[PDB]
Structure 1
Amino acid sequence: APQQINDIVHRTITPLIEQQKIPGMAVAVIYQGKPYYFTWGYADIAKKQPVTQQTLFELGSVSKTFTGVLGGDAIARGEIKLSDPTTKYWPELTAKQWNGITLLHLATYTAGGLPLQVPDEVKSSSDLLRFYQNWQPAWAPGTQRLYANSSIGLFGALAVKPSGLSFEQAMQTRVFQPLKLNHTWINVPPAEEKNYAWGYREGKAVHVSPGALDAEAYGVKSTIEDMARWVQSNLKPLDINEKTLQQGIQLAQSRYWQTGDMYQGLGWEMLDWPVNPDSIIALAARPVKAITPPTPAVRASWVHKTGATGGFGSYVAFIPEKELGIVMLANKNYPNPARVDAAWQILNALQ
């Protein structure tokens, strides 16, 4: 890499790894559109396997960016509309609280307090229906944001219904394959296990457990190379040949709601750039202001998403107007502020 990139990345990341006791980490910097890769430490401590550019990490909630884009693609295809009632795609959802809750609300965590987690006890399709039928909103739709797997997770599941495909099949065919993300998986195949890092939680090697709506909310695994390509694709959607996918990416970066300095997209979250680094809790309820109509993707944005599983911590941030971005994948779930601080140090130095 150019020495400037080499130096700021190493001088930022090495101390981070030391301070947070991160076993293994991969970083990609996208600079003037080109990717530069860095790796440290161990994918598997016990087996002494190093992190490489082919190592798979659990993205955790960074998966929601894929879900948002897949949903965007389904909108572009005319298969769904964000203004559609949820009940249009799940008629069995007959309980009265669902009147007025749209796909937009599900996608953007504004349905009225859907909970962060789908309970472990919810497994079958019948269990899932029961759960949503019994849920009692605390708030009217479109008034408060509460970040929630059960919200965007349901959005993802419903968004693919008209397609006839499973969520996984839709994601593969419509998102992963066209973008050549050939080492990105909802379910890691046996052939790829050699490259699947272990996560570390309290010193124990762990992988994400199966759960309802896992694929949709937190279940993607990917390499640093594929994630760099994901950032490139989101930085420059116009280079994407597939029309509805190009559109879907644009829709996911539209600004639907504002809370403080942040704007909610589909999966992605955005702030105006330049962004006060200080501007970038188990449950955090915030009133939202509707952006009527949503602002199309603003190039002068800090666009980002954090993600965690029990054993992994991921972060992606990019600035379209600067053709600049970063992916940080680690096999420990370390504090979000440390992720953002490191990303900002690096991108600020390069912009």
Structure 2
Amino acid sequence: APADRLKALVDAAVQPVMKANDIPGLAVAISLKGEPHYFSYGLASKEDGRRVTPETLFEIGSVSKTFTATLAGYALTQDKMRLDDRASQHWPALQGSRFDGISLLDLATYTAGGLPLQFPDSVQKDQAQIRDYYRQWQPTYAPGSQRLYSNPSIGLFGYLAARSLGQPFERLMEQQVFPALGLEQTHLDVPEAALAQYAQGYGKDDRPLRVGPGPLDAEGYGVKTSAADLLRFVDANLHPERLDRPWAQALDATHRGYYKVGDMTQGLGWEAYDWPISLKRLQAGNSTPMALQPHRIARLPAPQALEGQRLLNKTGSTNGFGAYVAFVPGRDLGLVILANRNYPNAERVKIAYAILSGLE
């Protein structure tokens, strides 16, 4: 039967990668021809034997950047900001700093001039420390020239988008974004009543790891969600026209490419590839050098619609978790893979590619 073939395909993609990477628990959700399919494996917590289900909450790390991009898309639709605004327009504390010469687009797409991967360990989760960090920062190279993947960069983009809307970022996400997207199992701060669903994360020697507080954590990497809710977010990305118009436009704003680095076209949050493309090329686009090294960009003459025969994706990790999301707009196909180990991105893409190739 078709259910046996689909389970065989997903099990064959997942099971060897879970064993090889010692992943305790993993949830898959697939959207195929307008229908959801869930496959759950292993344990959300090894110690109490709680099994993974499509409702288990996982940390999705930098997949959160696609939610941040959606909130910024909403601020853009409301005309509260423009991508070509100077960053300091939205935060007076930054007036007179180098952010007078950096656009919101540069922050969103990691091209502001060398903002680092992480905030320095000296910057705690404190408004004054974050403010002072940005006031004193000076670019290593010209804005708009080199991409250096960065939590302070897109984190400031999200923070400024929230300021443009006159409310804190976390509040806008809880009170407006998640409800508009129909997401009731998606959190920045997991409620006490939902804690029984929160998987344990595992690191070296199975040390337990759940994400701790950090500066602009919500904007950069702070979402916890289930495979079922993350697939609902993928389905909203596949069909923005099904949402009320302002939210449809917010999602559309995340489907616009601004420049290329190798095979990857950078949108707001989402990273896109031509589809089909080899597995080795998709792994290279999601590789450690893409996260850690600067790359010169090839700017597009106009923003490009990220639709049709393309694969849009994002990896996300925390110390204890490893997520991957991918969708193909022109095929009405979406996939989520959530795990409670930070296992190599190449292995996440390997599972996804085996599934997507087998569905085809």
* Counterpart among 138, 141, 153 of residue 136 in structure 1: 138
Residue 285 of structure 2 corresponds to which residue in structure 1?
A: none
Residue 226 of structure 1 corresponds to which residue in structure 2?
A: 229
1:257 Cα deviation from its structure 2 partner: 1.3
CA contact (8 A) 1:108 1:265 kept: yes
Equivalent residue letter for 2:98: Q
Counterparts of 1:331 and 1:124, CA distance in 2: 28
2:254 aligned with 1:252 = yes
CA contact (8 A) 1:120 1:211 kept: no
1:210 Cα deviation from its structure 2 partner: 0.3
Q: Deviations over 1:87-126 (max 9, x none)?
A: 1001221355323200000101010110111123323221
Counterparts of 1:235 and 1:208, CA distance in 2: 29
Counterparts of 1:197 and 1:142, CA distance in 2: 39
Counterparts of 1:254 and 1:5, CA distance in 2: 32
Residue 31 of structure 1 corresponds to which residue in structure 2?
A: 32
* Counterpart among 150, 165, 184 of residue 186 in structure 2: 184
* Counterpart among 204, 209, 213 of residue 207 in structure 2: 204
Residue 195 of structure 2 corresponds to which residue in structure 1?
A: 193
Residue 269 of structure 1 corresponds to which residue in structure 2?
A: 271
More displaced stretch, 76-85 vs 132-141: 132-141
CA contact (8 A) 1:258 1:264 kept: yes
CA contact (8 A) 1:53 1:223 kept: yes
Equivalent residue letter for 2:256: S
Matches for 1:142-161 after TM superposition, within 5 Å: 142-161=144-163
CA contact (8 A) 2:89 2:100 kept: no
CA contact (8 A) 2:29 2:54 kept: no
CA RMSD, 1 decimal? 1.3
CA contact (8 A) 2:272 2:306 kept: no
Q: Which runs of 4+ in 1 moved over 3 A?
A: none
Counterparts of 1:72 and 1:107, CA distance in 2: 11
Counterparts of 1:305 and 1:33, CA distance in 2: 21
* Counterpart among 322, 327, 331 of residue 336 in structure 2: 327
Give ranges in structure 2 of 5+ residues lacking alignment: 283-287
CA contact (8 A) 1:55 1:223 kept: yes
Matches for 1:1-351 after TM superposition, within 5 Å: 2-122=3-123, 123-202=125-204, 203-240=206-243, 242-280=244-282, 281=288, 283-351=292-360
CA contact (8 A) 1:256 1:290 kept: yes
Residue identity over aligned pairs, in percent, reads 44
Counterparts of 1:38 and 1:161, CA distance in 2: 40
The alignment partner of 1:82 has SS state of: coil
1:339 Cα deviation from its structure 2 partner: 0.5
CA contact (8 A) 1:183 1:223 kept: yes
More helix by proportion, 1 or 2? Answer: 2
Counterparts of 1:62 and 1:318, CA distance in 2: 13
CA contact (8 A) 1:71 1:248 kept: yes
Counterparts of 1:349 and 1:298, CA distance in 2: 21
Give ranges in structure 1 of 5+ residues lacking alignment: none
Counterparts of 1:17 and 1:338, CA distance in 2: 9
1:340 Cα deviation from its structure 2 partner: 0.6
Equivalent residue letter for 1:41: G
TM-score by length of 2: 0.94
The alignment partner of 1:316 has SS state of: strand
Q: Deviations over 1:149-194 (max 9, x none)?
A: 0000010011011322211121123321022110000000000000
Count of matched residue pairs: 350
TM-score by length of 1: 0.97
